[PDB]
Structures are given as C-alpha cells and as structure tokens.
Tab-separated table of C-alpha atoms in Angstrom:
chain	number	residue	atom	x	y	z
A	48	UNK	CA	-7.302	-92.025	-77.719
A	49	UNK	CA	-5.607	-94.934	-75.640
A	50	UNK	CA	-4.564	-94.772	-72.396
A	51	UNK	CA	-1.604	-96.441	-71.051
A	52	UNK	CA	-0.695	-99.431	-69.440
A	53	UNK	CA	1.841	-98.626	-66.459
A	54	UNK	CA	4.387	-101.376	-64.536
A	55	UNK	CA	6.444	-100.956	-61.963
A	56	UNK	CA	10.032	-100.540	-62.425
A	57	UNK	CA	11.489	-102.491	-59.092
A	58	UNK	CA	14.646	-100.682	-56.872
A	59	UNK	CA	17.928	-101.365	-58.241
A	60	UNK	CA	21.437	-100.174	-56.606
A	61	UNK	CA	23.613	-100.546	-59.503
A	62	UNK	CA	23.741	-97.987	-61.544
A	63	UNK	CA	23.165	-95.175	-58.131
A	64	UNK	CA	25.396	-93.886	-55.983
A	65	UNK	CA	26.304	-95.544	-53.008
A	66	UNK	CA	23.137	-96.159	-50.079
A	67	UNK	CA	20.531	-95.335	-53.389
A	68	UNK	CA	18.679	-97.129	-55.210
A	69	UNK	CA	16.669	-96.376	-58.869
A	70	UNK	CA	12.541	-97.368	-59.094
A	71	UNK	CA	10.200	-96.037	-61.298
A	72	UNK	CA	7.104	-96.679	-63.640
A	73	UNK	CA	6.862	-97.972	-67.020
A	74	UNK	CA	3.762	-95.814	-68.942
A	75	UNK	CA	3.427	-97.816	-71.855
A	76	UNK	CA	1.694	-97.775	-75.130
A	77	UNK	CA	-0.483	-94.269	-74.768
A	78	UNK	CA	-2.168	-91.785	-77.296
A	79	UNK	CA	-2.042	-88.597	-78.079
A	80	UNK	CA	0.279	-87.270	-75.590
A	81	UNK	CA	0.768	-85.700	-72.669
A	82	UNK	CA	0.987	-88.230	-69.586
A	83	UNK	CA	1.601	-86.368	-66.175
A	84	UNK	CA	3.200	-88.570	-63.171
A	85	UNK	CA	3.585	-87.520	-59.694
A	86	UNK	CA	5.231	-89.422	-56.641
A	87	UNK	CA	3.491	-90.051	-53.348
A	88	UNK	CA	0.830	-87.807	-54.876
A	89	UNK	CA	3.038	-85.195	-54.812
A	90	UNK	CA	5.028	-85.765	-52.171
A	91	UNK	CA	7.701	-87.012	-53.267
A	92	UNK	CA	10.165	-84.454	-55.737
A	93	UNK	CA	13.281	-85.038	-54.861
A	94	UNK	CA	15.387	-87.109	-56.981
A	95	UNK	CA	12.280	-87.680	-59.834
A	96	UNK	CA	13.338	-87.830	-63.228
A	97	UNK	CA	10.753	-88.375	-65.407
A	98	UNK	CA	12.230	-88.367	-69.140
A	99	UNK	CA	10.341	-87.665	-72.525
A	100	UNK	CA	8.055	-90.178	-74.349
A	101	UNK	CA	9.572	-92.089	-77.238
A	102	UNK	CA	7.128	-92.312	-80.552
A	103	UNK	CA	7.092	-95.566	-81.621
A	104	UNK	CA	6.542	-97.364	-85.207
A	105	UNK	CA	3.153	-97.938	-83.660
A	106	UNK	CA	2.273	-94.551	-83.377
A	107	UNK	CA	1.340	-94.914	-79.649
A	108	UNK	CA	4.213	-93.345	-77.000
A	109	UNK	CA	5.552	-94.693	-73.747
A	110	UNK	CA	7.412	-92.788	-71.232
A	111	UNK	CA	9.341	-93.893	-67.911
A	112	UNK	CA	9.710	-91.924	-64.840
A	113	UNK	CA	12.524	-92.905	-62.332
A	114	UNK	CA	13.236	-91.479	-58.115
A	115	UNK	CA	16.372	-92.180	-57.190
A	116	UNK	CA	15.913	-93.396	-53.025
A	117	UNK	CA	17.998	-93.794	-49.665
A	118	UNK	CA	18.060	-97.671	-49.888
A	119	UNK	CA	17.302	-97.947	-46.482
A	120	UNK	CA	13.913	-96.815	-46.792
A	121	UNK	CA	12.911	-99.494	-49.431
A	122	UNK	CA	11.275	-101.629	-46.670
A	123	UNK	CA	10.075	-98.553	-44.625
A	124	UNK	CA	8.091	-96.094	-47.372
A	125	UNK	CA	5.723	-96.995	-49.398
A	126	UNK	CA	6.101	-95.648	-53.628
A	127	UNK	CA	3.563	-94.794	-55.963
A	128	UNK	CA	3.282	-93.250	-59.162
A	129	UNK	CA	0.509	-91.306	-59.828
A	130	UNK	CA	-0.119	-91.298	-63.580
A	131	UNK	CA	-2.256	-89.392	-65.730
A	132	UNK	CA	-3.707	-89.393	-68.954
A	133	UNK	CA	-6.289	-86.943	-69.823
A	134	UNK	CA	-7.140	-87.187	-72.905
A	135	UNK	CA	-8.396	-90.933	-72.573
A	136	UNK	CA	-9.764	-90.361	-68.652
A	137	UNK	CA	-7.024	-92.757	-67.273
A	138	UNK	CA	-5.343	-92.464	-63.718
A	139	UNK	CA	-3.470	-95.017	-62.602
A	140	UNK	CA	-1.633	-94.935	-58.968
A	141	UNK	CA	1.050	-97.890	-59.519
A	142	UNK	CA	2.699	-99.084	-56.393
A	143	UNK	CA	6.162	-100.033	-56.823
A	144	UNK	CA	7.783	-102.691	-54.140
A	145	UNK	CA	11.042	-104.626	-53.993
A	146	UNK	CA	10.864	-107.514	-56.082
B	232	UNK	CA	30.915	-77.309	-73.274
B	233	UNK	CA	33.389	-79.834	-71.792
B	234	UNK	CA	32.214	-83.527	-72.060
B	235	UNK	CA	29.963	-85.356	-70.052
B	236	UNK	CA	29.831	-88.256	-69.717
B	237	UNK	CA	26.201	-90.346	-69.812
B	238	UNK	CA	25.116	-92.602	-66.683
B	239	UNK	CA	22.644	-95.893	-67.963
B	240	UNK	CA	20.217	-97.582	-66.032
B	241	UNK	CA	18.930	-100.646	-67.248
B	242	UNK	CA	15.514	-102.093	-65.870
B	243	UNK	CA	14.170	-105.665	-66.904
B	244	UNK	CA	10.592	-106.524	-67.558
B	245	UNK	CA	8.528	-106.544	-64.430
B	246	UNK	CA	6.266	-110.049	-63.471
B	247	UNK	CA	3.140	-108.056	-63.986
B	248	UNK	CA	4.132	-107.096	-67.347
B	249	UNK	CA	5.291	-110.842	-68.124
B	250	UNK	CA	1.918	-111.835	-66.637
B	251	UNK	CA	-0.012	-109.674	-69.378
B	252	UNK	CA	1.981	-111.302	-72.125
B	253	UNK	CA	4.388	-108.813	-73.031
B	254	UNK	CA	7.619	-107.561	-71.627
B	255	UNK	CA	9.810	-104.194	-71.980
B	256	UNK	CA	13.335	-103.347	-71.152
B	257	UNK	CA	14.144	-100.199	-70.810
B	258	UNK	CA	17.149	-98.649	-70.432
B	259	UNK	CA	17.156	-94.490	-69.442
B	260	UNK	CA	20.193	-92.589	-70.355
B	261	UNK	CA	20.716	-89.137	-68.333
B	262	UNK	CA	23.529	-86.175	-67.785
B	263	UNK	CA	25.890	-86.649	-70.954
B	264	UNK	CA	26.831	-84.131	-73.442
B	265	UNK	CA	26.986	-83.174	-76.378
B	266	UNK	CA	23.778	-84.404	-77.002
B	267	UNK	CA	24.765	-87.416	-79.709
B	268	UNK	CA	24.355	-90.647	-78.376
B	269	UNK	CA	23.490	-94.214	-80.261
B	270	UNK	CA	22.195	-96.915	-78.518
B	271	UNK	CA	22.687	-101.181	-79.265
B	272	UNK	CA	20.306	-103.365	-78.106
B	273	UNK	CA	22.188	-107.368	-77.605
B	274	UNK	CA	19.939	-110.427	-77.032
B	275	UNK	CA	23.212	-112.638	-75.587
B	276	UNK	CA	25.513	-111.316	-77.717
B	277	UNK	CA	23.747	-110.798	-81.149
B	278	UNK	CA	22.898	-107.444	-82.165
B	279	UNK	CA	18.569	-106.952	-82.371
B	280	UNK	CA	17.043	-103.738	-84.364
B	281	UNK	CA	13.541	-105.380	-83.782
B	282	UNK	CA	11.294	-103.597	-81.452
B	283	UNK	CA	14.155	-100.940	-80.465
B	284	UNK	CA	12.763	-97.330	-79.887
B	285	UNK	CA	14.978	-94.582	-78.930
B	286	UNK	CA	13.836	-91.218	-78.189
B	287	UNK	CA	16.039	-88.100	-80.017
B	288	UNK	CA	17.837	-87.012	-76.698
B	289	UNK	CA	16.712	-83.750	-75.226
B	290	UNK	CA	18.085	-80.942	-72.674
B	291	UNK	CA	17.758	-81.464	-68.665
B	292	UNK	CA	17.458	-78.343	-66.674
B	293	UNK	CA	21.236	-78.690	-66.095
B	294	UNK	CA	22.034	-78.160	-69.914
B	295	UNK	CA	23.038	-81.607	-70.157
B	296	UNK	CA	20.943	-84.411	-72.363
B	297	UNK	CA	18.860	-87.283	-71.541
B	298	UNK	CA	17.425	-89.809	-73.743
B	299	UNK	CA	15.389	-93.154	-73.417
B	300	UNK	CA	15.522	-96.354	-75.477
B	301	UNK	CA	12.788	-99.633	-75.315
B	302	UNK	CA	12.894	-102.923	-76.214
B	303	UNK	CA	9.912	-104.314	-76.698
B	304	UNK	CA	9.751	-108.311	-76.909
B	305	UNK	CA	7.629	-111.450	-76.163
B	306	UNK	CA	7.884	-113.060	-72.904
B	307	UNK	CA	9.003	-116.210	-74.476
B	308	UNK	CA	11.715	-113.749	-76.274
B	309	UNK	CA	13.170	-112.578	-73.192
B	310	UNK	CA	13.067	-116.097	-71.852
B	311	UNK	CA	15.142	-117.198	-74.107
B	312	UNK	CA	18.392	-116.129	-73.505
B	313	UNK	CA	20.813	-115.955	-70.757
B	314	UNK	CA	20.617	-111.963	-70.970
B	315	UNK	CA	19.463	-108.907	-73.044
B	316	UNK	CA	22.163	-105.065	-72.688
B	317	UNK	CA	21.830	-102.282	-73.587
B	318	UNK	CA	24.684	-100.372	-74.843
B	319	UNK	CA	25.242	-97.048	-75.193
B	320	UNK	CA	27.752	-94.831	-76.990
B	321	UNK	CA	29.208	-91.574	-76.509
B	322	UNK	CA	32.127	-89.562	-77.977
B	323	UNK	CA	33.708	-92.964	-78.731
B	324	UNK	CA	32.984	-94.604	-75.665
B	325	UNK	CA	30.836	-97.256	-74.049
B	326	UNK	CA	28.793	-97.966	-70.988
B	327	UNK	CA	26.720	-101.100	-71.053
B	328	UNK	CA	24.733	-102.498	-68.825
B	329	UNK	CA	23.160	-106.574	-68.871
B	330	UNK	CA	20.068	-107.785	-67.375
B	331	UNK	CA	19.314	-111.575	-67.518
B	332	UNK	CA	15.697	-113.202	-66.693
C-alpha cells in the first residue's frame, strides 16, 4: 500500500457560473484504491464533485475532488478536504485558500 | 439522448506541489454526453503524450458523463513555457482551456 499525497486546488471563477468559483484537492499517487473525501468534515455537500481515480502507467491512482462556492465567501469560510485512505492508515485534512 | 455538451476546468500545479518537486495539471471534464470524449494535452502549442492520464469517462447521477485527465511534469517542465491546455473534444467540437505559470 501507498497512501497519497494531496494539494490544494486554489478557487478559480472561470470556468463557473457567474458569483462561483471552483477549489478542490489533488489526491495523488495512492494504492490500492478506494480514497474517501469529505468537505468541512462533512459539512459541506453541496456543489462537491468528486470524480473517479485515473490508473496510471505507474500503477498507483490519483483522484480530484472539486466544490463549486459563492465567491464571496472565499475570504469568509474556511475549506478543507478531508481525505482518506484506509488501506495505508492515511488521513489528510488539506486546507485550501486563495492563492 | 440529445447532446450535451462537456464543461472543462483546468487547474495549474499548486506552490506546495512545486515545492515537493513535482507538479500536476489537471483538467476535470463533467456533464457531456454521449460518453466519448478525447482529450490533447499542448505544452505552448506542441502536442505532449508524455505523462497524460485520462480516466475512461463514467456516468454522473444525472445520466450524463464525467471524466478526468493529468499531466504530470517536472517543475522545471512547467516552467518552461509560456502555458500548458488542455483540450477537449466532443461530437466534433472543442473547449480548451490554458493555464500559464
């Protein structure tokens, strides 16, 4: 087993819609799978999308998990991802901040 | 099923991955159908295969697809040039999105 190493993904507005704004968490380079991730420690639901693991020529995963946020509470509410990986006995809570 | 089509978001390396010697873009494609997509990774504007892993997409709760590529580089790769996109095809059309260092 490996566990992961996990980066913040910083807010972006671009690709939202208008007053949102994309941030997430990288979970990179893990094995075997699965990886859980929560938000705020469960808090936080709406707007999560966190998408499958890719397989890569490694033969470790990684997976990314994205919220989608009112923009205007960037500077106001604190984000974490809670990430775990039990078959290596790895939690990490990531926090992810403006860049 | 009519034609949907998919929405990209493109995220750079972050510092603290930089600052551990390694970087990752990452580029997460949601909400398009049917579930074909291909995916071309540019460094400027030349074409890279290397370190490009795309998952096979799979079905959201809203019967629509999502899918994920990475590319995986050296911080003195993604230095290097004025930008990296990500490019993604559907049905014949493209959505690509640039991130630059």
């Amino acid at each position: 087993t490996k566990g992961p190493s996990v980066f913040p993904l910083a807010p972006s507005s671009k690709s939202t819609s208008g007053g949102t704004a994309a941030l997430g968490c990288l979970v990179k380079d893990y094995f075997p799978e699965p990886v859980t991730v929560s938000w705020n420690s469960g808090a936080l639901t709406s707007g999560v999308h966190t998408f499958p693991a890719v397989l890569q020529s490694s033969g470790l995963y990684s997976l990314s998990s994205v919220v989608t946020v009112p923009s205007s509470s960037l500077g106001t509410q604190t984000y974490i991802c809670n990430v775990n990986h039990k078959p290596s006995n790895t939690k990490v809570d990531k926090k992810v901040e403006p860049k | 099923q009519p034609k949907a089509a998919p929405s990209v978001t493109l995220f750079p390396p972050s510092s603290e991955e930089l600052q551990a010697n390694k970087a990752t873009l990452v580029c997460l494609i949601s909400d398009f159908y049917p579930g074909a997509v291909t995916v071309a990774w540019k460094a400027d504007s030349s074409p890279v295969k290397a370190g490009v892993e795309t998952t096979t997409p799979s079905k959201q709760s809203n019967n629509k697809y999502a899918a994920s590529s990475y590319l995986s580089l050296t911080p003195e790769q993604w230095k290097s040039h004025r930008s990296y996109s990500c490019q993604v095809t559907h049905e014949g059309s493209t959505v690509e999105k640039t991130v630059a260092p």
